[PDB]
C-alpha cells in the first residue's frame, strides 16, 4: 500500500522519516526493496533539509554500511544527493564529513564497485558543498579530575543553580514548603551557599561526568585568559551572559562531542533501562549524527554552556572545501602507499579510488597544485607500467583529467617529460603506451595553452624524430605541444611541399604547419596565407584522409589566423568540389538506370566546407554593397547535392566513422547598399523569389517563369527555399 | 566675506576637476544621441590599530636594519640631487647629517624611519596575514657619504604583497590625516584610495622600497539598478523584431526583451518577466544565469533580436552571432536596458541611418525590422524611479 504514495511540509518530512524508519526494518525482503523504492521515489520527488536530516540517518546508515541494504539506501541517498546537487548548484558539511566516512567505507575494503559509484555520487555531491543502535560512552567515573578544577566546579554549579533559579524567577517561581505546580511556588528556589556539599553534587555530577568525559578524551583544559523584568520574590540570581560567549569551531566540534557525550550516557541509561522494564525504545534513542540539529541542541545547549563558561573563565579548552582538496592530498599519500603496491585486493580499491579521483577532477589553493605534482607522482608509477591493466586505462582518463588540472590555472614532474623523449628515439629505433603518455601530455600542453626549457628541447628532438621518417597522430600530439625562425624558413620549405602536390611527408609537416600556428602570437599572417595555399595543397590531396582532418583543425588554426585572395582560388577549389558533386550526382543519374564511393570525396569537401566556415567574413559581403555570392550560388548547388537522395546519407556514414545558411546573407545582395535600405524603406525581389519558391513546389524555366539574372538569384532563393522546407523536418 | 570657510574651489582638493552635472540623470546628450546613464555612485578616512598590535623585539630589530637599508635608499633619493654628510637642520641648505648609516644618525631623527618602519610591520600583525620568516636574516658614485646595501633586487615583489602594502600606506596616510586634523582645507586630508596616482606614487614607492627592503630581509606577506522599459504601446508580439544596443562603459548591463508586465523592483531576468544577458560574464540570464557568450569590449555594439511565430529570441555583438529559444509568447515584448550605478547604455530604435556596422549585417538580412520604420515619432522609454 506504500506504492500508492509513490503515485504544512514538515508534517510530510515526519511521513519520510517513518518511511526511513520501514527502511532502518529493512536495513517480505524483496517487497522491503519495494518499500527501499517508496523512499527512493520519495526522494526523487523532493523541504529538503528535513531529508537531508533523515540522510543524516542515512549517512551513519551508510558508516554502518562498511547491511547491503543499508548501502542500497546510500544509493538512493546518493541519487538524492546528486538531485540535490542539482539544487545546491548548514549540515552540508557535515555531510561531506559523511562523503569521508564514505572514503573510510572505501578504507574498510562486486557490490563493492556500485557502493563505490553510489559513493562517487556522494562525493560529487560534496564536490557541490566544496565549490540495533550501539551507544559508546566513554568511562567518566574512573577519571580523575585534578583537584584544583573541582572549586572551578562549585563556581559551573554555582552557576548552574544561578539559572535554575532565574529560569524559575521568570515564570515567577518562590520559595516554599512543597511542589504545588499551581501555586507557582518551589521548595529548593533558595541560594545556593546554602546547600549542604551533597545538595551541591546533585547539580555538580552530571558536570563533574563532562569534565571527566573531557580528560577521558584527553582534552585540554589549563589556566590562560582571566576569569569574568522586575525583580522577584525570593533568592535573585543575576547569572553572567554565558550565551553571548562564541566557541571556536575547534570548540564547536568539542560542545557537539560533549552533546555527544550525554546523547550515548543518557541513550544507554534509556537502553539498560528499557532492557530492565524489557520495554522497547525512545525517540531519541539513535546515533548522535542521525539526530536533526535541533534533537542535538537539547543537550547542546548544555555542552556550549560548559565550554562557553569555561571560555568565559579564559581557560584554554582544546581536544588536544579547499580543507577536502587536503584530503584529496591524504588520498595521494594512499596513492603513495599504491605507489608501495606498484613496487610489487585493497588495489581493487586503489581502482575504484581512480574512479572517484577522476570524477572529482570533474568538479573542478596552491594545495590543489600539489595534489596537480602528487598527480604527476602517480602518472610517473603509471609510466612505470607504460614500457588491472583497465584500470591503468582508467588512471589514463584520470591522467586527461590530470590535464583538465592543468587547465584549472613541482618541475620536476618535466623531467619524466624529459625521459619520454628518448622513449621517442625508440620510435626511431621501429610501448604504444608511452605515446598515449606522450598523447596526455599533448592535452596537458594545450592546458599551457589555457594560460624545464631543456625538456621542450628534447620535445624538439622528438620533432627531429617526426623527421626520421599511426606517426601523424605523434604529429598532431607534436603540435599539441608546440602550444625559432630556422622553423620559419623550414615552414617556407613546407609551403615549396605545398607547392609539390609524397603526402605523407606533407603530413609530417603539417604539425610544423599548427606550430606555425602557434607562432601566430605581423608576418605571420602572410605566412599564414602561405599556409593557406597548404590548405590548397591539402585540397589538391583531397581532389580524390584523417591525417587530412588533423589538418583541418590546422585549416581552424587558420580560422584563428584569417587574405580574400586565397579565397578567390578557394572559391574555384570549392567550384571544383561543386562539379566533382554534380559529376557524382551525375553518376548518381547513372544508378537511377556509385556515389557511394565518392561519399568519401564528399567527406573531404565537407572539410573544405569547414574551410569555407574559416572563411567566415560577411561583413565584407556588407562591403560588397561579390564574388562570394557566386561561391554562394556553388554551396547551393551543394545544398542541392545534399537534397538529391542517399548521398547526403553515406556523408552522415563518414560522420558517423568520426554551410549553407551563410550565403543565405548573399541572398539579400539579390534583393539590392543604400538601396537595400530604402528597400526595408519600402515595407524588392525577394516577393518574386517567394513566387519562385512557390514554382520550386513542382527549375531554371521558373526563373524563365518571370533582368533574367536577378530571375536566375530567385531561382538560388528558390532552391535556397526548398532547401528551408528540407530545413522544416528538423 | 569675514565668515570662516574655505573656498569650493579648494575643493578640487582630492583629483577631480571642477566641471558641472545635471545631478544623477539617467541620460546624458552623447554625439550620436541620447546615451542612457547611471545610475551614479557616491568617506572621511580613520586612522587604525595596528598600533594595539606589537611586533616581537627580534623581528624589530631586523626591521631596524630593513629601515637602515630604506633610509641608504632616501640617501640615494635625495644625495644625488645635492646633499652631503655633516649637521645642518634645513632642507633648503642641502645638507642633513641623517644622510647615512643608522649607528651614525641622530637616535631621535633616525626614528622618523626605524619605528615607522616597525609601523609596518605592527600592520602586519593586524592584518592577520601571513609574515613569517621565510629565509634566513641578511655602484654609484655618491657625493659625500656612500651607504653600500646589499641589491633589494632580488625576487620580485607577489602582487598580494603591493595591495596589502597599499593598504599600509593608506593606513598611514590615514594616521597622518588624523596629524593634520590637529592642523578649511589640507593639501592631503583625502584618503589614499582617492587621489591623484601621481600623488600616489610616493606612497607606493615607500610600500614597495619597504617590501623590497623585507625581499631583502627574506620578509614576505600575503593576506539601485537602472533600468530601461520600452512603453507599452509598442510592445511587439507580432512576426520578427529587432534592435541595436550601442554600448559605451564596459559594465553590467542586462540589455535584452522583457513584457510589460515586469515588475521593477526585480533587477532584470530574475523572474519569468525577463529575457536579458549582461553586459559583462557574457552570460544570458533567466531565471538566473548560464554561460552564453563573450562579454563585449568597451564600444562594443550589442544586437537584440526576436523572432516569432517560430519563437525565439537571439543576441549578436556586432553581428556576432552567439539564446532564449523556444520562448513561449505571452503579452510582450519590449526592449529592456539595465544599469550598474556606472554604466552607460544607447538603445537606439529605428531610424536605419542611426544603425550601421552591427545592424545591416545581421539583422537586415534575418527579415528583422527596426521600431522606427513604424514610428514617426522618437520611440518612448520609460527608466525606473528610485
Known amino acids: ?730 | 566675506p569675514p565668515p570662516g570657510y574655505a573656498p569650493c574651489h579648494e575643493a578640487v582638493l582630492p583629483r577631480e576637476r571642477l566641471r558641472l552635472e545635471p545631478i544623477k540623470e539617467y541620460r546624458r546628450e552623447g554625439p550620436r544621441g541620447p546615451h542612457l546613464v547611471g545610475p551614479s555612485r557616491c568617506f572621511v578616512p580613520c586612522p587604525v590599530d595596528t598600533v594595539q598590535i606589537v611586533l616581537p623585539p627580534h623581528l624589530e630589530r631586523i626591521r631596524e636594519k630593513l629601515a637602515e637599508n630604506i633610509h641608504e635608499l632616501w640617501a640615494l633619493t635625495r644625495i644625488e640631487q645635492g646633499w652631503t654628510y655633516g649637521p645642518v637642520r634645513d632642507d633648503n641648505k642641502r645638507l642633513h647629517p641623517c644622510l647615512v648609516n643608522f649607528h651614525s644618525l641622530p637616535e631621535p631623527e633616525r626614528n622618523y624611519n626605524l619605528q615607522m618602519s616597525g609601523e609596518t610591520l605592527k600592520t602586519l600583525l593586524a592584518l592577520g596575514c601571513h609574515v613569517g620568516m621565510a629565509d634566513e636574516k641578511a655602484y654609484m658614485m655618491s657625493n659625500g657619504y656612500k651607504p653600500a646595501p646589499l641589491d633589494l633586487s632580488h625576487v620580485r615583489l607577489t602582487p598580494a604583497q603591493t595591495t596589502l602594502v597599499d593598504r599600509l600606506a593608506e593606513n598611514g596616510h590615514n594616521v597622518w590625516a588624523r596629524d593634520r586634523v590637529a592642523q578649511r582645507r589640507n593639501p592631503r586630508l583625502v584618503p589614499y584610495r582617492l587621489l591623484d596616482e601621481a600623488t600616489k606614487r610616493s606612497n607606493r614607492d615607500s610600500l614597495c622600497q619597504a617590501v623590497r627592503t623585507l625581499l631583502g630581509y627574506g620578509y614576505n606577506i600575503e593576506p539601485r539598478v537602472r533600468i530601461f522599459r520600452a512603453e507599452k504601446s509598442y510592445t511587439v508580439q507580432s512576426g520578427r523584431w529587432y534592435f541595436e544596443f550601442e554600448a559605451v562603459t564596459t559594465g553590467e548591463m542586462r540589455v535584452g526583451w522583457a513584457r510589460p508586465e515586469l515588475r521593477p523592483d526585480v533587477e532584470l531576468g530574475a523572474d519569468e518577466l525577463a529575457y536579458v544577458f549582461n553586459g559583462h560574464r557574457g552570460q544570458r540570464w533567466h531565471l538566473g544565469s548560464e554561460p552564453f557568450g563573450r562579454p563585449w569590449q568597451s564600444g562594443d555594439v550589442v544586437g537584440c533580436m526576436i523572432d516569432l511565430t517560430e519563437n525565439t529570441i537571439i543576441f549578436t555583438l556586432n553581428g556576432e552571432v552567439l539564446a532564449f529559444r523556444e520562448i513561449e509568447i505571452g503579452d510582450g515584448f519590449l526592449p529592456v536596458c539595465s544599469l550598474g550605478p556606472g554604466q552607460v547604455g544607447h538603445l537606439n530604435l529605428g531610424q536605419d541611418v542611426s544603425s550601421l556596422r552591427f545592424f545591416a549585417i545581421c539583422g537586415l538580412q534575418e527579415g528583422f525590422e527596426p521600431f522606427a520604420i513604424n514610428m514617426q515619432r522618437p520611440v518612448t522609454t520609460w527608466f525606473s524611479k528610485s
Open chain 1, 1 to 730: 500500500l506504500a506504492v500508492l504514495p509513490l503515485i504544512p511540509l514538515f508534517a510530510g518530512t515526519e511521513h519520510r522519516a517513518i518511511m526511513v524508519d520501514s527502511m532502518l526494518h529493512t536495513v517480505r525482503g524483496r517487497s522491503l526493496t519495494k518499500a527501499q523504492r517508496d523512499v527512493i521515489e520519495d526522494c526523487l520527488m523532493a523541504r529538503p533539509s528535513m531529508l537531508q536530516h533523515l540522510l543524516r540517518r542515512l549517512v551513519f546508515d551508510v558508516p554502518i554500511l562498511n547491511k547491503m541494504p543499508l548501502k542500497l539506501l546510500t544509493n538512493h541517498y546518493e541519487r538524492c544527493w546528486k538531485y540535490y546537487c542539482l539544487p545546491t548548484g548548514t549540515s552540508e558539511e557535515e555531510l561531506h564529513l559523511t562523503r569521508k566516512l564514505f572514503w573510510g567505507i572505501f578504507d574498510s575494503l562486486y557490490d563493492q564497485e556500485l557502493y563505490r559509484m553510489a559513493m562517487p555520487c556522494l562525493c560529487a555531491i560534496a564536490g557541490a558543498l566544496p565549490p540495533n543502535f550501539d551507544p559508546r560512552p566513554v568511562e567518566t567515573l574512573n577519571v580523575i579530575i585534578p583537584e584544583k578544577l573541582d572549586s572551578f566546579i562549585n563556581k559551573f554549579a554555582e552557576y548552574t543553580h544561578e539559572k535554575w533559579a532565574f529560569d524559575k524567577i521568570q515564570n515567577n517561581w518562590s520559595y516554599g514548603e512543597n511542589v504545588d505546580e499551581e501555586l507557582k511556588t518551589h521548595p529548593m528556589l533558595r541560594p545556593y551557599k546554602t546547600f549542604s556539599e551533597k545538595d551541591k553534587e546533585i547539580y555538580r555530577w552530571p558536570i563533574k561526568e563532562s569534565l571527566k568525559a573531557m580528560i577521558a578524551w584527553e582534552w585540554t583544559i589549563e589556566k590562560a585568559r582571566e576569569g569574568e523584568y522586575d525583580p522577584r520574590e525570593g533568592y535573585n540570581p543575576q547569572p553572567p551572559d554565558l550565551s553571548g560567549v562564541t566557541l571556536s569551531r575547534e570548540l564547536q566540534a568539542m560542545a557537539e562531542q560533549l552533546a555527544e557525550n550525554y546523547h550515548n550516557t543518557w541513550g544507554r541509561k534509556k537502553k539498560q533501562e528499557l532492557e530492565a522494564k524489557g520495554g522497547g525504545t525512545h525517540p531519541l534513542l539513535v546515533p548522535y549524527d542521525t539526530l536533526t540539529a535541533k534533537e542535538k541542541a537539547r543537550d547542546r545547549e548544555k555542552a556550549q554552556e560548559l565550554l562557553k563558561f569555561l571560555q568565559m573563565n579564559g581557560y584554554a579548552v582544546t581536544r588536544g572545501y579547499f580543507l577536502s582538496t587536503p584530503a584529496k592530498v591524504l588520498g595521494s599519500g594512499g596513492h603513495a602507499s599504491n605507489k608501495e603496491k606498484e613496487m610489487i585486493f585493497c588495489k581493487l580499491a586503489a581502482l575504484v579510488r581512480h574512479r572517484v579521483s577522476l570524477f572529482g577532477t570533474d568538479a573542478p589553493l596552491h594545495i590543489l597544485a600539489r595534489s596537480l605534482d602528487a598527480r604527476t607522482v602517480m602518472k610517473s608509477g603509471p609510466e612505470i607500467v607504460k614500457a588491472f591493466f583497465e584500470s591503468a586505462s582508467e588512471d589514463i582518463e584520470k591522467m586527461v583529467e590530470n590535464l583538465r588540472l592543468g587547465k584549472v590555472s613541482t618541475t620536476v614532474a618535466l623531467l619524466p617529460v624529459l625521459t619520454t623523449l628518448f622513449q621517442h628515439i625508440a620510435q626511431h629505433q621501429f610501448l604504444d603506451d608511452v605515446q598515449v603518455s606522450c598523447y596526455r601530455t599533448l592535452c596537458s600542453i594545450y592546458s599551457l595553452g589555457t594560460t624545464v626549457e631543456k625538456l621542450r628541447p628534447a620535445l624538439g628532438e622528438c620533432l627531429a624524430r617526426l623527421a626520421a621518417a599511426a606517426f601523424l597522430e605523434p604529429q598532431l600530439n607534436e603540435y599539441n605541444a608546440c602550444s625559432t625562425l630556422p622553423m620559419l624558413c623550414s615552414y617556407l620549405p613546407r609551403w615549396w611541399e605545398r607547392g609539390p602536390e609524397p603526402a605523407l611527408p606533407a603530413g609530417a609537416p603539417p604539425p610544423c604547419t599548427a606550430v606555425t600556428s602557434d607562432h601566430l602570437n605581423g608576418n605571420i599572417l602572410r605566412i599564414i596565407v602561405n599556409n593557406l595555399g597548404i590548405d590548397e595543397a591539402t585540397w589538391m590531396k583531397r581532389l580524390a584522409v584523417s591525417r587530412a582532418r588533423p589538418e583541418l583543425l590546422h585549416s581552424h588554426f587558420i580560422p584563428t589566423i584569417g587574405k580574400r585572395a586565397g579565397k578567390v582560388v578557394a572559391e574555384e577549389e570549392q567550384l571544383r568540389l561543386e562539379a566533382k558533386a554534380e559529376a557524382e550526382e551525375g553518376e548518381l543519374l547513372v544508378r537511377d538506370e556509385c556515389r557511394d564511393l565518392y561519399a568519401l570525396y564528399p567527406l573531404l569537401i565537407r572539410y573544405v566546407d569547414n574551410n569555407r566556415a574559416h572563411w567566415l567574413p560577411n561583413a565584407n559581403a556588407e562591403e560588397l554593397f561579390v564574388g562570394e555570392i557566386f561561391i554562394y550560388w556553388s554551396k547551393s548547388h551543394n545544398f542541392k547535392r545534399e537534397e538529391q537522395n542517399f548521398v547526403v546519407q553515406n556523408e552522415i556514414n563518414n560522420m558517423s566513422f568520426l554551410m549553407a545558411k551563410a550565403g543565405d546573407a548573399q541572398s539579400g545582395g539579390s534583393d539590392q547598399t543604400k538601396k537595400k535600405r530604402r528597400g526595408d524603406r519600402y515595407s524588392t525581389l525577394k516577393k518574386m523569389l517567394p513566387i519562385g519558391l512557390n514554382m520550386c513546389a513542382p527549375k531554371t524555366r521558373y526563373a524563365l517563369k518571370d533582368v533574367r539574372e536577378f530571375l536566375q538569384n530567385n531561382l538560388h532563393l528558390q532552391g535556397k527555399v526548398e532547401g528551408s522546407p528540407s530545413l522544416r523536418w528538423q
